[PDB]
Scaffold this motif. Structure first.
Motif, PDB file in Angstrom:
ATOM      1  N   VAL A  96     -49.339   9.757  51.862  1.00  0.00           N
ATOM      2  CA  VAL A  96     -48.945   8.545  52.573  1.00  0.00           C
ATOM      3  C   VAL A  96     -49.514   8.588  53.991  1.00  0.00           C
ATOM      4  N   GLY A  97     -50.549   7.796  54.259  1.00  0.00           N
ATOM      5  CA  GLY A  97     -51.065   7.638  55.630  1.00  0.00           C
ATOM      6  C   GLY A  97     -50.237   6.569  56.298  1.00  0.00           C
ATOM      7  N   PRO A  98     -50.284   6.524  57.652  1.00  0.00           N
ATOM      8  CA  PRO A  98     -49.499   5.528  58.405  1.00  0.00           C
ATOM      9  C   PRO A  98     -49.983   4.125  58.119  1.00  0.00           C
ATOM     10  N   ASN A  99     -49.069   3.168  58.034  1.00  0.00           N
ATOM     11  CA  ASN A  99     -49.491   1.765  57.964  1.00  0.00           C
ATOM     12  C   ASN A  99     -49.383   1.188  59.373  1.00  0.00           C
ATOM     13  N   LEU A 100     -50.527   1.037  60.044  1.00  0.00           N
ATOM     14  CA  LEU A 100     -50.542   0.486  61.400  1.00  0.00           C
ATOM     15  C   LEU A 100     -50.003  -0.948  61.453  1.00  0.00           C
ATOM     16  N   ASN A 101     -50.211  -1.699  60.394  1.00  0.00           N
ATOM     17  CA  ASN A 101     -49.693  -3.064  60.328  1.00  0.00           C
ATOM     18  C   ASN A 101     -48.174  -3.093  60.109  1.00  0.00           C
ATOM     19  N   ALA A 102     -47.584  -1.930  59.792  1.00  0.00           N
ATOM     20  CA  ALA A 102     -46.107  -1.777  59.756  1.00  0.00           C
ATOM     21  C   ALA A 102     -45.610  -1.058  61.024  1.00  0.00           C
ATOM     22  N   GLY A 103     -46.494  -0.930  62.011  1.00  0.00           N
ATOM     23  CA  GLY A 103     -46.154  -0.301  63.280  1.00  0.00           C
ATOM     24  C   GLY A 103     -46.017   1.215  63.221  1.00  0.00           C
ATOM     25  N   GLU A 104     -46.611   1.859  62.210  1.00  0.00           N
ATOM     26  CA  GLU A 104     -46.526   3.327  62.070  1.00  0.00           C
ATOM     27  C   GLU A 104     -47.587   3.979  62.947  1.00  0.00           C
TER      28      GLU A 104
END
Length: 172
Positions: A96-104
């Motif tokens: 699981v990489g960060p979802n930048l569009n989910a603010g991760e």
């Protein structure tokens, strides 16, 4: 039956290699021992890479992943679990990489790529690409800094690939 039949790659470092190819096509050609899925923490395999891989397995990946979630619950961002690779590979490492569009936080890509170090040889996409919102060149840079085992990266992105090639030439 021969496995890990990787060919036509550009070796960026002694550990990280790249090829401009669809990851499912490449799984068929290379017969890898390990494929990486770009997962979310709930292992809901729809969209981008996850959907492509699950479709290639005729939903077998989702069925196993549902059972996993039932017994074990969700992953953490930056975490992984090892599951069957079904018809794609022997094993699938769901990372699981960060979802930048989910603010991760994009720095979680370091933790995400560290998971690759648990297998000797891997076929993988770049993590946090597509609608996960990381610029793929940045995702590649973190992979190169972090991964110590042999990773073969498949990108279906001519723009990215030709830039990566230009960067390689500039660095010789």
């Amino acid at each position: 039956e021969p496995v890990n039949q990787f060919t036509g790659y550009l070796k960026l470092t002694d550990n990280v290699a790249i090829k401009c190819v669809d990851i499912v096509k490449e799984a068929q050609s290379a017969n890898p021992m390990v494929i990486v899925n770009a997962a979310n923490i709930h292992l809901k395999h729809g969209g981008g890479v996850a959907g492509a891989l699950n479709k290639a397995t005729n939903g077998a990946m989702q069925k196993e992943s549902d059972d996993y979630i039932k017994l074990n619950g969700p992953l953490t961002v930056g975490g992984s679990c090892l599951l069957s690779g079904h018809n794609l590979a022997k094993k699938c490492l769901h990372v699981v990489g960060p979802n930048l569009n989910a603010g991760e936080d994009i720095q979680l890509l370091k933790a995400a790529y560290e998971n690759f170090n648990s297998q000797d040889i891997l076929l993988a996409p770049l993590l946090s690409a597509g609608i996960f919102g990381a610029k793929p060149l940045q995702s590649l840079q973190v992979c190169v800094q972090t991964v110590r085992t042999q990773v073969y990266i498949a990108v279906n992105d001519k723009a990215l690939y030709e830039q990566v090639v230009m960067d390689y030439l500039d660095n010789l």
